[PDB]
Amino acid sequence: TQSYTNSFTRGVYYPDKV
Amino acid sequence: QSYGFRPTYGVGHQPYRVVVLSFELLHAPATVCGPKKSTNLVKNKCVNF
């Protein structure tokens, strides 16, 4: 049902609009 | 709790309408500019923008 994985280099977004 | 707003009360208990206008001045696409006027779009010359 539940598993444990790791994000290597993902999860980043643009903080501002510049 | 409810207010006791009555015209008999002097300064300090009368109802006062407060309007808070929160703005966002960061660089972003805006659509609430002040009226003003659009001019011509010149290019390749030292002008104001």
| Cα separation, B30 vs A7, whole angstroms | 36
Chain B residues within 8 A (CB-CB) of chain A?
Answer: 26-29
B chain contacts of residue A15, beta-carbon cutoff 8 Å? none
Q: Which residue has the tokens 């309408």?
A: B17
Resolution in A: 3.8
Q: What is the DSSP letter of B9?
A: S
Residue of B nearest to A17 (CA): B28
End-to-end CA distance of chain A: give it in Å, rounded: 41
A chain contacts of residue B28, beta-carbon cutoff 8 Å? 17
B48, B30, B29, B31: which is closest to B39 by C-alpha? B48
